[PDB]
Design goal:
Layout lengths: L7 E2 L4 E5 L2 H8 L3 E5 L9 H9 L3 H13 L7 E5 L6 E5 L12 H7 L6 E4 L11 H11 L3 E6 L2 H9 L3
Parallel strand pairs: 2-7, 3-5, 6-7
Antiparallel strand pairs: 1-2, 4-5
The structure holds the ligand CC(C)NC(=O)Nc1ccc(C(=O)N[C@@H]2c3cccc(O)c3C[C@@H]2C(=O)O)cc1.
Organism: Severe acute respiratory syndrome coronavirus 2 (2019-nCoV)
Protein name: Papain-like protease nsp3
Subunit structure: May form homohexamers. Interacts with N protein.
Length: about 170
């Protein structure tokens, strides 16, 4: 038993809810919140910008030190940093950005990072300003992630379409 509430169960291990991931992290305080990161950990907009704003820019400060030490992530890769006031940990995961021409097949590799964590609060990778089809992203998620994932979908219209179109 865990504290995630009001989710619709899609499969054995994937759950979805129309919710603002920032508000959901502040309320649940999950072990892991997933950020929709880029390789530079520049949290400017979309989910990343929102999560970072909610940390009063502490996420960005920590991220800049990480990059200065380690260099950029790989598309499809991830790193674990602090969750600040939102979670114990933040898993920064880099899905491909279609608006940069990145290979959509890397979306499966991106979701594989979730399997290193028993339970996660997450957005749909590569959705939103990353330019991929969220229906495709949800399918890859369900077909790749084996651990327990609670997906927060900000847009109600998209959530309903994601739900009604789900096989
Ligand atoms: C009010 C404050 C305290 N909170 C806050 O600013 N929160 C927040 C901001 C932006 C996003 C976001 O960019 N969402 C994306 C979005 C939008 C429309 C269609 C989509 O396919 C997607 C994918 C992705 C998602 O929904 O995961 C999420 C939360």
């Amino acid at each position: 038993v865990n504290s995630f509430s009001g989710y619709l169960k899609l499969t054995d291990n994937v759950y979805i809810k129309n919710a603002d991931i920032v508000e959901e992290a502040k309320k649940v305080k999950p072990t892991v919140v997933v950020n929709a990161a880029n390789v530079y950990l520049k949290h400017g907009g979309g989910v990343a910008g929102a999560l970072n704003k909610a940390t009063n820019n502490a996420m960005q400060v920590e991220s800049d030190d990480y990059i200065a030490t380690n260099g950029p992530l790989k598309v499809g890769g991830s790193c674990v940093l602090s969750g600040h006031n939102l979670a114990k940990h933040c898993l920064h995961v880099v899905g491909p950005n279609v608006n940069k021409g990145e290979d959509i097949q890397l979306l499966k590799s991106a979701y594989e990072n979730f399997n290193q964590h028993e339970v996660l609060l997450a957005p749909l990778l590569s959705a939103g300003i990353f330019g991929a089809d969220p229906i495709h992203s949800l399918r890859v998620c369900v077909d790749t992630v084996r651990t327990n994932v609670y997906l927060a979908v900000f847009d109600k219209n998209l959530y309903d379409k994601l739900v009604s179109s789900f096989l």
